[PDB]
Design a protein around this nucleic acid. Structure first.
Lengths: 122, 209, 114, 114
RNA sequence: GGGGGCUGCUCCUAGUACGAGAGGACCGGAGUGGACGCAUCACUGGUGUUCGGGUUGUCAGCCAUGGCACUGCCCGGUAGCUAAAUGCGGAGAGAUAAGUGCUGAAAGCAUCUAAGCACGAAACUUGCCCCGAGAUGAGUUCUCCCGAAGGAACGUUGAAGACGACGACGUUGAUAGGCCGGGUGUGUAAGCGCAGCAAUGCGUUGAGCUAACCGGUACUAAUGAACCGAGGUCUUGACCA
RNA sequence: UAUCGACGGCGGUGUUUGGCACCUCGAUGUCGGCUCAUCACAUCCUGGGGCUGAAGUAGGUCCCAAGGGUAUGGCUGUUC
RNA sequence: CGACACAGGUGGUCAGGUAGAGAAUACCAGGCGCUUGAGAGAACUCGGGUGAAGGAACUAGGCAAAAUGGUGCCGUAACU
């Protein structure tokens, strides 16, 4: 995942697709991986209620195409890319429910509230 | 006999009741004829041969001792016909692996890891690699930056780069001795051992097991 | 045996490799890995062709299980975390061992079909 | 590089041909004279080309006149030079080196058919 | 003689010390990440005019099976090498500056100084890895040798190699090939039966063909003979007889 | 006199500009960029310290020190 | 003809020899082999093929390359 990339949304906030812009604390030539919080600007969504289409917010990458290897030696790959929108309230999703599975290292050590709302875990 | 030495044959494995299945590196440990033993001293930190013990020389074995008591003695190698040995010289120099080697015993095996010419920063001193799209930019094994501040257009000697190698000594500790068997008097070491096949590797009672 | 397969019958001992996998065959796998609080019960997942696996250390293959976002991944059978498998749909054809497709083309008449 | 594969002294094509011919030479006349990487690979052009041409049958000689374009030395490979090698496996037609000849300095034996 | 390790996050310590509250640390001990450095691939993944298949034109009468466009084109693709792969990369010890002190005068007080002295910097030296007898204190050891010790030339192949080398073997041989077997790659054969009007659809065949690995096995392939070829220098330092 | 700091006075550097024009004037391919090698420091930090309008935290200023690290991107050919 | 046994230039007739829309590839007839050699599986340069994921982010400009691309049916906008 790099800047100007189009990924899908995982929460029911009204947004459909998202376009990456920048990554927080990542001075590298094009990049944004699973677990990294990035500044974004949704493209397709509901242009009313609360100006969705056009606004810039933050999000957390959950699924990507690139394959990641695990301690056992097996690599896993997904179809496309997805992310979850978060508000000002320190690492808190703006949506109600989440869609799609999540990683393990993203539970215990880092987020404990995201796992509680996660339906699947690989 | 601070330890013995053999030639790496290859890597196999032996499933033992106790413990669990684990790869084993076969090492040829055979007849040697140590005529003398060269002892080195640690002057500051520069190896230097104190003396050499022949078939009969109490004038050299004495200095060898004491210096050891002073803990100033360095690694010990002795003029050998095939492979090394220590207290083996005093006897006659003629000995077999059966005399020194038991199984299930822990030993420290050191050796020079395996000419490859010039290599890329990565394949070289383990440098990582361009993860992320960095790899997509087909810039796989490249630091991407020879050095900061284009001016000087110089690369800090530090700023590790590419170069020559092959043609590094490593002493892996805690290497359990599975067993001594094969067509010839060999040794079965648990796991892997530094260096390629045919390379000379030494054995030594595990300093700490 | 030879000094190449003489040191491979132990680790991952050739546990009677289930007749199938074979072509379209979709045998539901198993599991027993913890990853979390070690109390993991059984599990289930559909498969497909995309067969794979050699002599000594063979492996299932590209699972290609529809359920969920999609699929992929697979543990080599046998494995420390392995148990017996079972059957499913009876054969089909094309060329099992290397059967691409099935991916980038998975619908009704499209999947479970050559 | 890699292990010792074939040996294309010239290019790709010049390297099936050359085998055919210099294959029928060691059956039309029990004497031939090439070079070093000479008929050593032509020792192969013949046997195969013998065996599969051993016992007379339908799907045997049909392989003979396929590598060797000639009716003369494809018939004399049977009913002669077989049966003539009845109870003999291999050794069909070997040959030992010989001093290099004039012109192009290239040592050469003389195939022959024992 | 050549060289590097820099930085960040998290846990324990604290929601404690400090503070009205808000707010909010530290020393130290650990785990890990990013980045930059010698190798190795078993695992995951990328390559292939080896190979298998489909198919157009044309020739062998058709069929079968093949030649040609120096893989006809198209589809797939094994080994090695590789990478988005994997294993490894200290601590510690020593010395000054700024500075902190001791003892102590010149000024019988005082004073880190003026003599002397105790400590004190990621950097420096070392550790560690690599190169290295042309390392100009230009090495060490053993044996052989001053008319015969030893050595160069050749032949068969590489764990080798960019033309002048290196390494292994040379019948006290398995080094290479053949054969067989082992370990692998493809996918249903020839023929015939009944198939069928035919393409080719069936049955007999879950049948053949093929290999740039390994083992067994000398069966085959590693002579003969020539030749480069110095001969224990001189003076003296001690011992043996 | 934490910090800021006029008037006036005394200097160092020579990266700027001005001046002179002593030298070249019997010809050493431009600008910018790129690629690649070495050197320097008027240290932006890391390290050790002083002061504070220094409670703590976070900062401001200053000293020793360059060992390492001091490294990148979007628009514009463009150097502000 | 071009200073040369110079891959340059130079008019007419044979455009029904055999497979396709055709004077497009393959192949009789006829003609020819008059466009310097030998031995290991480097770097570099000239032509070219294939490359995962993104894909013009390169560039003065998509230059280059590629894509579409036969035939039949359906259907076909602004403008004129």
């Amino acid at each position: 995942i790099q800047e100007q990339t189009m990924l899908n949304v995982a929460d029911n906030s009204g947004a459909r697709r998202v376009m990456c812009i920048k990554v927080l604390g990542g001075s590298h030539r094009r990049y944004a991986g699973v677990g990294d919080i990035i500044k974004i600007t949704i493209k397709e969504a509901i242009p009313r209620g609360k100006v969705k289409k056009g606004d810039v917010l933050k999000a957390v990458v959950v699924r990507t195409k690139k394959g990641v290897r695990r301690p056992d030696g097996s690599v896993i790959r997904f179809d496309g890319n997805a992310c979850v929108l978060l508000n000002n309230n320190s690492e808190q999703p703006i949506g109600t429910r989440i869609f799609g599975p999540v990683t393990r290292e993203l539970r215990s050590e880092k987020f404990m509230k995201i796992i509680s709302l996660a339906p699947e875990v690989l | 006999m601070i330890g013995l030495v053999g030639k790496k044959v290859g890597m196999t494995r032996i499933f033992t009741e106790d413990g669990v299945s684990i790869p084993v590196t076969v090492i040829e440990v055979e007849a040697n004829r140590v005529t003398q033993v060269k002892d080195l001293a640690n002057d500051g930190y520069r190896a230097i041969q104190v003396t050499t013990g022949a078939k009969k020389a109490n004038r050299v074995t004495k200095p060898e001792a004491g210096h050891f008591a002073k803990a100033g003695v360095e690694a010990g190698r002795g003029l050998w016909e095939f492979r090394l040995a220590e207290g083996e010289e005093f006897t006659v120099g003629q000995s077999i692996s059966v005399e020194l080697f038991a199984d299930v015993k822990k030993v420290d095996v050191t050796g020079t890891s395996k000419g490859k010419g010039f290599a890329g920063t990565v394949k070289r001193w383990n440098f990582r690699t361009q993860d992320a799209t960095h790899g997509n930019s087909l810039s796989h094994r490249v630091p991407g930056s020879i050095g900061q501040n284009q001016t000087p257009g110089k690369v800090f000697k530090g700023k590790k780069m590419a170069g020559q190698m092959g043609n590094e000594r490593v002493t892996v500790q805690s290497l359990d001795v599975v067993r001594v068997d094969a067509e010839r008097n060999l040794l079965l070491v648990k796991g892997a051992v530094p260096g390629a096949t045919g390379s000379d590797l030494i054995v030594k009672p595990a300093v700490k097991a | 045996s030879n000094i190449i397969k003489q040191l491979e019958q132990e680790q991952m001992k050739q546990d009677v490799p289930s007749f199938r996998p074979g072509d379209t065959v979709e045998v539901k796998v198993w599991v027993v890995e913890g990853s979390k609080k070690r109390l993991q019960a059984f599990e289930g997942v559909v498969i497909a062709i995309r067969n794979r696996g050699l002599h000594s250390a063979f492996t299932v293959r590209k699972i290609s299980n529809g359920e969920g976002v999609e699929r992929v991944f697979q543990t080599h059978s046998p494995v420390v975390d392995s148990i017996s498998v079972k059957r499913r749909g009876a054969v089909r054809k094309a060329k099992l061992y290397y059967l691409r497709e099935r991916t980038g083309k998975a619908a009704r008449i499209k999947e479970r079909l050559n | 590089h890699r292990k010792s594969g074939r040996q294309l002294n010239r290019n790709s094509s010049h390297r099936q041909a050359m085998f055919r011919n210099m294959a029928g030479s060691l059956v039309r006349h029990e004497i031939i004279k090439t070079t070093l990487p000479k008929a050593k690979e032509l020792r192969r052009v013949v046997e195969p080309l013998i065996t599969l041409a051993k016992t007379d049958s339908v799907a045997n000689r049909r392989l003979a006149f396929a590598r060797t374009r000639d009716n003369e030395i494809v018939a004399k490979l049977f009913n002669e030079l077989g049966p003539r090698f009845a109870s003999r496996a291999g050794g069909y037609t070997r040959i030992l080196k010989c001093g290099f000849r004039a012109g192009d300095n290239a040592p050469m034996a003389y195939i022959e058919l024992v």
